């Protein structure tokens, strides 16, 4: 019984992992995407479901709601953040600093510590507890033996801080408990309580991580540094180094490393090898026999317990029920009075147009999800009758230099099109281009719009550091998709990391005059392309 890496070959960066009795946790960042901070479940470290968000809608400041266009809040939000479950009163703690301060929100677990860490999926509750106005940078927090929360944190230097017994306010700190002997910068704290003594994983980025160890015996440290790896080559070409993550236990007592690597333009995505531990008390990784991160290993758990999520990655998703799955995050926070899940087996959501703009990015409802690699195929299949004069709905491959297939409404005219040169500028995050009509497709009368269906091919094979950009093309279905046609040129995708976000499959709708007009989604399907 082995695996291959990487384990999850989509965009989930900044991970912490902890395991509670039989099942693993895996919180990752998502900068402006709401709702933020996923968390992922596993029982063996290798298959991995989405099962809630850490924060709902995202309370950080009125640019969070996009009402202004760009630059909005753009690749701000919520960078590298920190997640434990708390045994003492069944309660997890999510902790990120967001633009200067540090956001708690926390759920209860429904008594997860006494039924081997399930969480049952009604239980999730996630509200916002506190604020704590000092920047915890790259936190990571340690719920400590004796119920004392610490939280490491810093960039380019380490500091740990000491919270209350309730978490919502910082009572001790210590500067400067691990600084670079060349002054190099180090970030990305984890921090755990290890056979009587303690660690803090730190990334060099972004090539190598760090273990520091208290030469004390206390939380405050001081801490020495041995690396635990730097440059190493594998598991994946074209993807940077695998840098940052944490480390974790499974219940039979051996370690694991979970880190991730620069797989743009896919995103970052996680590769896990075992830990073995010195006698002298240092964690060190289990290479393959030639020094590389191993494209195999041994499960890390054996027998482990079955899935049953219930929506995987590629499972059709008919927005059945009330709730999104947790596959899906809006850019920026939605605004609720204009869309509209009606639930039910028929299930269906309801796009009304939120924004007046001539620009995507300026756009509120633009509604996002992750694409699985190394190649996958997104299907929207949608009812756009509900459009009006001066609409435009479609399907967009969707990050800083993006395109989409999609409809635009002019009078009475429904037409297909296809836009390219969708681009926010790097620096400062404000649009550079509000596109170009690349290729038009045919007019659709009112039995086509009342089912098109919209194509995504995506190439997100690992391209970083490397003189070739991967492309995209775009189809549409109007025979109910039994046949698709190609529509526009190849679509050259950034290497770009300065987003930090992957691409991502999305689905859109604004006008360009005015509130009023709708689209239905009926449906959204992954299909890996082989």
């Known amino acids: 019984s082995t695996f291959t890496n990487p384990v999850l070959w989509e965009d989930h960066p900044d991970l912490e992992v902890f395991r509670v009795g039989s099942v693993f946790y895996y919180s990752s960042s998502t900068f402006a995407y709401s709702p933020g901070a996923p968390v992922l479940k596993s029982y063996d ?51 990120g600093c967001v633009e200067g301060r540090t956001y708690l929100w ?19 509750n996630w509200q916002h507890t506190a604020t704590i106005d000092n920047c915890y940078a790259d936190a990571g927090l340690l719920i400590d033996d004796d119920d004392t929360m610490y939280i490491a944190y810093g960039n380019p230097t380490i500091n740990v801080a000491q919270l209350s017994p309730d978490g919502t306010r910082q009572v001790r700190v210590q500067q400067r408990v691990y600084a670079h002997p060349q002054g190099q910068t180090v970030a990305g704290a984890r921090m755990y309580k290890i056979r009587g003594n303690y660690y803090i994983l730190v990334t060099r980025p972004a090539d190598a991580e760090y273990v520091l160890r208290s030469t004390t015996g206390s939380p405050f440290g001081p801490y020495e540094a041995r690396t635990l790896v730097s440059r190493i080559q594998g598991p994946l070409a074209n993807a940077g180094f695998a840098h940052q993550g944490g480390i974790v236990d499974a219940p039979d007592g051996t370690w694991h490393y979970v880190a991730f690597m620069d797989a743009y333009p896919g995103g970052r995505i996680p590769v896990v090898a075992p830990l073995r531990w010195t006698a002298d008390g240092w964690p060190e990784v289990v290479t393959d026999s030639q020094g590389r991160w191993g494209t195999s290993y041994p499960i890390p758990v054996r027998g482990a317990k079955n899935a049953t999520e219930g929506l995987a990655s590629t499972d059709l998703d008919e927005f059945r029920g009330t709730r999104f ?40 409802n633009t509604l996002t999800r992750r694409i699985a690699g190394p190649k996958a195929s997104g299907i929207f299949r949608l009812d756009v ?64 719009q009342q089912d098109i269906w919209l194509r995504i091919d995506a190439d997100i094979t690992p391209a970083f550091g490397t003189n070739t950009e991967r492309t995209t093309t775009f189809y549409y279905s109007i025979d109910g998709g039994r046949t698709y046609t190609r529509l526009g040129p190849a679509f050259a995708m950034t290497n770009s990391w300065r987003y930090f976000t992957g691409y991502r499959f999305g689905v859109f709708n604004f006008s360009t005059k005015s509130l009023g007009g709708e689209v239905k989604v009926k449906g959204f399907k992954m299909n890996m392309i082989l």
């Open 325 to 364: 799955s947790e596959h899906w995050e809006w850019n920026h926070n939605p605004d609720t009075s204009k869309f509209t899940l009606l639930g039910g087996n028929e299930g269906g959501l309801i796009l009304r147009t939120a924004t007046v703009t001539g620009d995507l990015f300026a756009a509120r």
């Open 106 to 124: 926390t759920s209860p677990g429904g008594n997860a510590l006494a039924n081997n860490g399930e969480v049952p999926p009604s239980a999730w």
């Open 45 to 95: 470290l290798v298959h991995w479901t989405p099962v809630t968000h850490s924060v709902p809608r995202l309370n950080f400041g009125s640019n969070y709601d996009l009402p202004s266009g760009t630059p909005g809040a753009y690749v701000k939000g919520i960078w590298a953040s920190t997640l434990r479950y708390r045994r003492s009163n069944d309660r997890f703690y999510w902790y």
């Open 385 to 448: 009758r509900g459009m009006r004069d001066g609409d435009r709905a479609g399907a967009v491959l969707f990050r800083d230099r993006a395109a989409y297939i999609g409809v635009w409404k002019q009078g009475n005219e429904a037409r297909i099109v296809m836009v390219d040169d969708l681009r926010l500028n790097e620096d400062g995050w404000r649009t550079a281009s509000t596109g170009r009509v690349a290729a038009n497709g045919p007019v659709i009368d009112t039995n086509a």
